[model samples]
Target: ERVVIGSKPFNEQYILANMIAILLEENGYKAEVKEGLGGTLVNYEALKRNDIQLYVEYTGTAYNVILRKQPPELWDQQYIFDEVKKGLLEADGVVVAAKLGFRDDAALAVRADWAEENGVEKISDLAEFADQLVFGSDPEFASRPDGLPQIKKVYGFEFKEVKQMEPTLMYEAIKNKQVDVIPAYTTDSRVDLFNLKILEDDKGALPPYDAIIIVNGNTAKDEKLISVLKLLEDRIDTDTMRALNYQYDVEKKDAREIAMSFLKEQGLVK
Candidate 1:
């Protein structure tokens, strides 16, 4: 019987779902995939009912949603991962598998030349040059608990202007110098796709977005799935994942094709 892997309605999920499905087939096992889901809650319910075997989930998600803990104001990846491991296996039948070695963290990115000229190297550095910079970000980012409120207080970023706009538009606005900085994600292919410089969050204001493969107990029974997916851990690095994500979002390439090409490049599957 062909195994099933689920995907959230997004590029990252599509690429990973296809990659895992391909790995299973390469190992002489067969699997099908579904790359569309509504939200995290829907996906979790499916996993709970053993509807779909595998998907990418975050440690923060497990801590707050699955385990039902009040997530700490600040997140430490190591602590969350360790606690999540204990809570899921013992209390629930779900399996938290290998980490994918990448996180989709919220980041601050500036035009390469702008960063060099201003001597801005970290989030804290922004405070010094806040007068000269206009920040472009979405409304949701400003409203999110860990988004701007904490950042503004901790970073002392009294921006010359806070330009609210759609998420996709922030990049181009920065590229054109319409905005000096933009809120970005670690996994976004656009950072490399557009050649922007990401700032280090020295104070760690944002939550962790560590990516891991989540599976149902029923799915883990095969054991082959674990072996197939383990090849991905520590292999998909920041630049690698960014490039893969770029191919889909910018190049309009099929995620399945992208996954197959990436697997071949990594020498993980024939």
Candidate 2:
């Protein structure tokens, strides 16, 4: 059977799935790139049930979803990566290959001016100011076990009002001052594009999202498989990923073109 790779329904996944497919083909494995599946849970189940062999995932998602565990208040990237790697292999017959050298975790962002004026440089700093600001986020983040609830539990902050909007709309709401603060994915291109102030997860309310390669039982221990996959480890850091995402999501570049360009730049594919 041909090795299959999967991706979630989003811009990042399209780019990553292509990257993996291209690399695998260059290294002798015929990779089938299945992009734009339903969501994380869908792809997770598909992999676990042996419907797919490999895909990209994040430490935060792996820890929260696959392991079904809540992270500690001070959990760091290294910790999530290490524990998730061990947990998956032991419990689910899967393997976490490596940290892709970037984080796409949860973040709290405010208009830069508001943050500076309110003295809110970190999540813990919001306690004194949050009750005065209107918070907004996508429904998913607002309700996740390790999301708003955990943030409130750890940082002890509550907003004046919370608005649940579509993920894309939340950015516009914040930009227009309709919402004073919002939860965002760390690697979102809009973070820098809109000049929003990303508060530090000082108390570690949310999980870290260092991206990784996940392989199910079928090829989890295949030396040729994991070895070639490790070529992506630490190769693309936060800035590089943000730029790539920006190009695809905002600048309208083709995902395959961007993926192929990156591989050559990294000298991973000729």
Candidate 3:
């Protein structure tokens, strides 16, 4: 049987979609990947329409954008995952098959050394240091309800200053100590390159965006296909994902090459 996969227009999503296609092909199914399908809703519509059988989606994106649910008082990874899985299966007939084991979401990050010096290991722990820290964020994050405001409301503290700048600038600003903290993409290579520390959302303030593989609900009963996809479950942690993105974003490798190499390394495919 032939299976079609869809991906959004980004290096990470491209690499992941290629990975799924390569893996499925190795297990005896013909796989085709439709690249750069605009964005989340577009991919979801295709999946629902049976134009594509699978894709990688973040839990937070599915919960907030697709399900159109208000954020819960607190963020719980498992709670959101369950909600997305249930909501998609019930509403759109999409099955969330596996958590691919990394989150590409925003988290408050500080220089590693600064976190060490202050003994701040989590978002809640930053409350005491709030008065002395300048927060840096992208323009959207500064104003989004689930962004800074929600953080302050949940953690019960405000930063000394909240600076809004371009998203790319946030990394440089934090790296040079221009801003003490910034909302960082958890899977971005810069988080590792700059030695930043991603603070734990101890109070569950930020929405969890764990990456998962979702199959068309109609295909859920295919035990063999599901079993093959399950080989990737709980693999590719945050650092590994950042490294994979590096191959695409910085190293300029083809997404198909990156996918095949990763599958071979994991012994998932020959």
The prediction achieving the highest lDDT against the true structure is 3
TM-score leader: 3
List pairs with backbone clashes in candidate 2: none
- TM-score per candidate: 0.90, 0.84, 0.95
The residue-by-residue lDDT of candidate 1 on 59-156, one tens digit each, is 87777777787656566778888888788777767887789988777888888777788787788888878787888989767877787678777776
Candidate 3 lDDT over 1-270, as tens digits, reads: 999999999888999999999999899999999989769999999999999888999999999989999888889999999999989998978898888998898888899987888798899988888999998878768666688778878899999997888887888898778999988888887788789988888888888999999989788879999998888899889889989988887788998999999999888887
lDDT, candidate 2, 76-169, per-residue tens: 8678888888888888888877667888877888888777787878888888877899988787785676777777777787789888888868
The clash numbers for all candidates, in the given order, read 0, 0, 0
Error of 2 at 268 (Å): 1.7
- lDDT accuracy of residue 79 in candidate 2: 82
Model 3 regions more than 4 Å off? none
| 1 against 2, candidate with superior lDDT | 2
Question: Which has the higher TM-score value, candidate number 2 or candidate number 3?
Answer: 3
